């Protein structure tokens, strides 16, 4: 850099902000370098020395331009029930998710730390609230006039067929049989 261009650390002039890759450090009262994603501030800047940025170690990360004193820990490796939808790298956290047919029983800010299988509503029972990424299916018993003849996390209680002359009446798990 030539003499024209100010290097970090420097005090910003009245009416200024720091540059794009810089932050204003309140202890030094100076503009100081941020560290890139994948690095952290091993040493904070002073009035005469800039930030010292070092690389993150494996299983730690920083996702943003930063001045953290240590990199953040990645979440634990996913268990065999889960799917790793984002790998742990020096620049991003690990993300674990649940498979279809499962919900997240213990949720993280991103992803899941404990998955559980969705309940299946047996014959005579239908879905009352469908499963969501973070909540189990809720079942209900089918009321007269309706039925469910399946074991299913999605099938609802559906109406009996109509007919005037009933050979075998419908119940909660089977349709009416009509003469």
């Amino acid at each position: 850099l030539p003499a024209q261009v100010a290097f970090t650390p420097y005090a910003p002039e009245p009416g200024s902000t720091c540059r794009l890759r810089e932050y204003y450090d309140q202890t030094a009262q100076m503009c100081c370098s941020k560290c890139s994603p994948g690095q952290h501030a091993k040493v904070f800047c002073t009035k005469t020395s800039d930030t010292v940025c070092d690389s993150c170690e494996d299983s730690t990360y920083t996702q943003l331009w930063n001045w953290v004193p240590e990199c953040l820990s990645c979440g634990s490796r996913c268990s065999s029930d889960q799917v790793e939808t984002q790998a742990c790298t020096r620049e991003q956290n690990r993300i674990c998710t649940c498979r279809p047919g499962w919900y997240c029983a213990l949720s993280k800010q991103e992803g899941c730390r404990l998955c559980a299988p969705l309940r299946k509503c047996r014959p005579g029972f239908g879905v009352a609230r469908p499963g969501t990424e973070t909540s189990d299916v809720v079942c209900k018993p089918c009321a007269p006039g309706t039925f469910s003849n399946t074991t299913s996390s999605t099938d609802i209680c559906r109406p009996h067929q109509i007919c005037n002359v009933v050979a075998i009446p419908g119940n909660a798990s089977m349709d009416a049989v009509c003469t």
Binding site: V68, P69, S73, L106
Partner: protein, 106 residues
């Protein structure tokens, strides 16, 4: 784990996360931003240590130890604060482990 046990376990995890977030907000309100940065790191390792109770229980005690060492290291010059965080995290993990053991014993 039945839904009651999961809810009690989740409530304990949230208590530790919410305590850490309040300590971060406190550091921000008092403008001790370098402490707020250290607390972000400690929070990330708390999350990993909690994860491991469910993904790989054989690693849990090692991840808890690494959490307390991170608190000791990053907050070495703030021993009062360091003691408060270790005590909340120790107490939180003891409760989660207690609920887990009680459910596995049934």
């Amino acid at each position: 784990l039945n839904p009651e046990q999961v809810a009690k376990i989740g409530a304990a995890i949230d208590a530790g996360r919410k305590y850490l977030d309040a300590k971060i907000e406190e550091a921000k309100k008092t403008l001790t931003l370098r402490t707020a940065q250290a607390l972000l790191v400690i929070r990330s390792q708390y999350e990993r240590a909690v994860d491991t109770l469910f993904t790989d229980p054989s690693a849990a005690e090692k991840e808890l130890a690494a959490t307390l060492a991170t608190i000791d290291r990053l907050l070495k010059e703030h021993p009062e604060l360091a003691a408060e965080i270790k005590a909340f995290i120790r107490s939180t993990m003891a409760e989660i482990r207690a609920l887990l053991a009680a459910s596995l014993a049934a």
